[PDB]
């Protein structure tokens, strides 16, 4: 009967849900081909984030530091930016894009990033006359927002930089697609959907090849596939499809204001209805029919979920944490399969935006159970509520919440970022029809294993 | 002989850590303290095991003395004076390479 938004009631954080803005800016940048982000700050701001990406993906990604040291903290760090850009350019001959990402240190000391970019542009034009390197200023102070906001800021700044340089050309006939912060498997699903619907689209950023092969020829293919050319062509698109309000919609709006490319923000496609509505929007903007192949994939997903919903899911209580577009989308998916998402945790200071999200209203009008949405949440909020008596049958969230579930003896499905404590999840779609099916089956299989380990009617797994 | 000294020096360099302490004064103390006990042990003299520092120089020295006797047949053949002479040359060489000509810029920092 009531969906209530409330903030965390503590000033401090125990067990943060998200990383800081610069980490999200790094994630945006590593999806660009021939890009090495340069993180202007102390060394930990780079190295810890490279480790985080290795935890999620089990791969290396290249990011550099400006190595701020004590002298720059007293006199300013511009010379560290300028050196860092040239040392990148000189040692990586194919490098084309450097997002220059600020940190808490370099925001506090007020280094003039745009001034350093003018110096480096002059230096690079003189030293490498036949090269163009795009330097994008990315302002990501860590004392506001989160890696979610930092992702969105970097995407927007890179797009502004590159489209500023190339402007509007000939119509491409393509869609721009900003899926937000999703896995390689989600990108693979979207590419299939557009191919089956005969819709040309660029997916920003294209992270499919983050899951790179170990090849006979020892080649390294672990790269973003989105090129300068692909980003520049965004000016020429027929439309933008933005799937994530907090993860790239603001770039869709920028391209609408600058280049009159109409932006369509839709619910993030977690679950069946949200996928349906995404495909209807694609059909509306392109004039292309939804193919039979997607009716069939949808029907296969529904068939699978129907084996689970009333038998194993109905009336089971769920807590969900992760990025806001993921939390809100998964809550809607859960209700489609008769799960009851009673506790939604969103991890940053953007509550004044979340209060206006139309999906809150979609929950307030649908749910038959109270939902608490805690914004500015940490993961201690979850643990403390369980310790105070909250009864949960399932947790859905990323791997940094694992000990909460382990100790409480609650089954947990790993979703969102980072999912380092299970194998291969970055390759499994979560969005779309196949993604809904895969999520539902992870939920059931986690419950099934729990029933066996706890001897809770484990004999029932025979004739369902 | 120079060969015997070269044997002792190559052993200490590849095996021991006490010559590589954090400051000049500690390297000097250890080179003197350990190698004086080595001399005692290799010449059948009563080791000094009074103070905690003495006991520790004995412990380091015992490993080296046992290893030198096991590795180098000459160390059981040369006389007391010859052992002493070699160990004096070894102190000089260890001070030369770990202190006098070390470019380790922390060695004379007054504070730890």
């Amino acid at each position: 009967a009531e969906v209530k938004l409330s903030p965390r009631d503590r000033e401090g954080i125990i067990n943060p849900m998200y990383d800081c803005q610069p980490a999200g800016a790094q994630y945006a940048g590593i999806g660009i081909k021939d890009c090495i982000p340069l993180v202007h700050g102390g060394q930990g701001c780079t190295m810890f984030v490279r480790l985080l990406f290795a935890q999620h993906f089990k791969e290396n990604f290249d990011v550099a530091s400006t190595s701020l040291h004590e002298e720059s903290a007293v006199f300013g760090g511009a010379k560290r930016v300028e050196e860092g850009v040239l040392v990148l350019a000189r040692r990586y001959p194919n490098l084309r894009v450097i997002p220059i990402i600020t940190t808490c240190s370099t925001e506090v000391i007020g280094d003039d990033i745009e001034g350093s970019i003018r110096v480096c542009n002059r230096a690079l034009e003189a030293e490498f006359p036949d090269r163009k390197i795009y330097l994008a200023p990315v302002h990501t102070p860590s004392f506001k927002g989160s890696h979610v906001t930092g992702y969105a800021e970097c995407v927007k700044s890179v797009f502004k930089t590159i489209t500023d340089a190339h402007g509007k050309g000939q119509p491409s006939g393509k869609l721009n697609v900003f899926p937000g912060w999703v896995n390689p498997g989600d990108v693979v699903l979207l590419k299939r959907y557009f191919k089956e619907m005969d819709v040309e689209a660029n997916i920003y950023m294209d992270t499919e090849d983050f899951d790179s092969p170990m090849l006979p020829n020892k080649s390294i293919e672990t790269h973003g596939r989105t090129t300068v050319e692909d980003i520049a062509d965004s000016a020429n698109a027929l439309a933008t499809l933005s799937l994530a309000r907090y993860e790239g919609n603001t770039t869709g709006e920028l391209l609408q204001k600058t280049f009159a490319v109409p932006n369509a923000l839709v619910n993030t496609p977690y679950g069946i209805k949200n996928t349906d509505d995404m495909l209807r929007k694609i059909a509306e903007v392109t004039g292309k029919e939804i193919p039979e192949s997607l009716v069939r994939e949808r029907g296969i997903a529904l068939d699978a979920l129907a084996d689970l919903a009333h038998m194993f899911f109905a009336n089971k209580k769920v807590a969900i944490f992760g990025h806001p577009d993921l939390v809100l989308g998964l809550a809607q998916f859960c209700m489609e399969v008769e799960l009851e998402p009673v506790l939604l945790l969103i991890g940053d200071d953007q509550g004044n935006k979340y209060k206006k999200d139309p999906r809150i209203e979609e929950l307030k009008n649908t749910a038959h159970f109270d939902i608490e949405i805690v914004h500015n949440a940490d993961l201690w909020e979850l643990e403390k509520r369980i310790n105070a008596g909250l009864q949960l049958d399932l947790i859905m969230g990323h791997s940094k919440g694992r000990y909460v579930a382990i100790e409480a003896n609650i089954p947990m499905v790993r979703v969102g970022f980072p999912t380092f404590d299970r194998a291969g999840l970055y390759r499994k779609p979560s969005i779309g029809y196949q993604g809904a099916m895969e999520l539902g089956e992870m939920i059931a299989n986690a419950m099934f294993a729990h029933m066996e380990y706890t001897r809770n009617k484990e004999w029932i797994l025979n004739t369902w | 002989s120079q060969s015997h000294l070269d044997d002792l020096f190559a052993y200490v360099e590849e095996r021991c850590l006490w010559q590589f302490f954090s400051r000049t004064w500690d390297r000097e103390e250890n080179i003197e303290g350990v190698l004086n006990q080595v001399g005692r042990l290799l010449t059948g003299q009563e080791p000094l095991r009074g103070t905690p520092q003495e006991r520790l120089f004995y412990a380091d020295a015992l490993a080296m003395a046992n290893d030198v006797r096991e590795r180098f047949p000459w160390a059981s053949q040369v006389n007391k004076e010859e052992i002493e002479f070699l160990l004096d040359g070894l102190k000089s060489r260890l001070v030369d390479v770990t202190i006098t000509r070390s470019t380790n810029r922390e060695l004379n920092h007054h504070l730890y």
Binding site: G41, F48, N60, T66, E70, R80, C104, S142 | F20
Partner: protein, 473 residues
């Protein structure tokens, strides 16, 4: 000689950081620069000073709140990244704390935000009464006086004890600075602020061991067998209050001389406790260390009984691995000390030839040690970077690399296997059993069917797919 790599032609200052050991050289003329400023934009492996204080040393403790005064990233980034178990359910790995610094705190100060966070942390976990507070980049820059806040909290809450560390990430050049600041503050402020019961004639501290995969708990089986009381472990499987008792020990045994030599040196200066450096990795090294400890205490026969049993249990397996690992080439790209603890121990005990080594943050002291113990024809790199790693692989062609997981995932593409040189694969790796565990992981890494499979191009009609025969000790 010193080496100018092709990838460093435009950063030629790197030549004084890279030594290739050649016959007959006076190594005093070729000591890498170390512990100097990083070059921006290189993809250096270095971390920050805050990491060296909280992640490496302080965060190991099993009963202490780790309050990171700063924005939430520094906290997020040092959580779910270490493998230092405890015997109390891994409290240290389950939790991290942040003051969640916001823009208003940059403007107006963060001292009241810290104070409030501290009391919240003690209120949320009423069984925990110890805390370390760390500064980070922006709380250092705005001048919050965390020692004065801690003083007020301890006045207001007399059942807690709080320690503070100033270690913003821009301090020093690397993690090394954090070690130093923490070590000296601890001995200045907290040693000899309580005492414990002495239950043995033989007492020691074990200084510079962080319980990676249970290393400290494995070594503790030796001290219990020998009847030695360990007053404090700095800091593996440790407690805040045990560290306040360090002055009581008769002997300080040091393994990590880089991170923790500082406090051993000050304990000797101030309390007369001798510093004994050992190697607690390496099979024959562990025997030497036990014999020195036992010679210091006058319990030599107890030491020889322990060594004999451990060799009877483990040496046959060690020698099985040596037969199969002899002549394999290894690289070690870690922080610094494991270079000099491992180069000669894998050579002696496993027949492995270490052909390239890189230290993130070692000092000239660490290079003295590793060059003294290391081979001719080996590369010794201070503050190595990613392009240098590729050029070095092309020069020395290692069969295995001991390094962190991200680099391990990079060199996998070149079909080179890795062992996690930091957090281990299947540890512990200290002690007699531990070196057998290290050898097993090395063996399974290199003699791995997947490596052979990856090299086959199925399109080549001249190629078949091989089968390899493995073994087990």
């Amino acid at each position: 000689p010193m080496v100018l790599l092709e990838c460093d032609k435009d950063i030629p200052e790197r030549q004084k950081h890279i030594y290739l050991k050649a016959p007959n050289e006076d190594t005093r003329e070729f000591l890498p620069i170390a512990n100097a400023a990083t070059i921006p934009g290189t993809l250096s492996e270095r971390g920050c000073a805050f990491c060296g204080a909280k992640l490496v040393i302080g965060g190991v403790l099993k009963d202490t709140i780790q309050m990171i005064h700063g924005p939430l990233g520094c906290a997020y980034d040092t959580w779910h990244t270490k493998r230092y178990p405890t015997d109390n359910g891994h409290f240290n790995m389950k939790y991290v704390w942040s003051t969640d610094m916001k823009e208003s705190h940059v403007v107006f100060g963060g001292e009241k935000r810290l104070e409030k966070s501290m009391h919240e942390a003690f209120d949320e976990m009423p069984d925990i009464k110890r805390m370390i507070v760390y500064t980070t980049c922006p709380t250092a820059l705005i001048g919050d006086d965390i020692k004065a806040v801690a003083k007020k909290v301890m006045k207001d809450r007399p059942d807690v004890d709080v320690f503070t560390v100033e270690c913003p990430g821009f301090s020093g050049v690397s993690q090394s600075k954090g070690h130093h600041v923490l070590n000296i503050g601890w001995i200045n402020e907290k040693v000899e602020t309580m005492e414990k019961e002495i239950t043995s004639e033989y007492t020691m501290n074990f200084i510079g061991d962080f319980n990676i995969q249970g290393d400290t708990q494995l070594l503790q089986t030796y001290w219990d067998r020998l009847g030695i009381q360990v007053v404090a472990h700095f800091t593996g499987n440790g407690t805040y209050d045990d560290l306040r008792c360090m002055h009581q020990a008769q002997l300080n045994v040091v393994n990590c001389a880089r991170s923790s030599g500082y406090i051993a040196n000050e304990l000797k200066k101030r309390y007369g406790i001798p510093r004994l450096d050992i190697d607690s990795w390496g099979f024959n090294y562990m025997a030497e260390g036990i014999r020195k400890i036992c010679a210091f205490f006058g319990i030599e026969e107890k030491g020889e009984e322990l060594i004999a049993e451990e060799y009877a249990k483990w040496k046959p397996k060690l020698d099985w691995y040596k037969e199969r690992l002899q002549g394999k080439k290894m690289a070690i790209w870690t922080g610094g000390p494991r270079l000099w603890h491992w180069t000669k121990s894998v050579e002696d005990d496993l027949g492995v030839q270490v052909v390239a080594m890189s230290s993130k943050f070692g000092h000239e002291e660490d290079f003295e040690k590793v060059i003294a113990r290391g081979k001719e024809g080996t590369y010794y790199i201070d503050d190595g970077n990613e392009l240098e790693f590729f050029e070095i692989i092309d020069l020395v062609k290692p069969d295995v690399i001991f390094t962190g997981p991200r680099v391990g995932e990079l060199v996998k593409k070149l079909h080179i296997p890795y062992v996690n040189g930091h957090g281990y694969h299947n540890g512990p790796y200290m002690g007699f059993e531990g070196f057998v565990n290290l050898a097993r992981d090395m063996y399974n890494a290199v003699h791995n069917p997947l490596r052979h499979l990856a090299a086959v191009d199925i399109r080549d009609k001249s190629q078949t797919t091989p089968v390899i025969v493995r073994g087990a000790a």
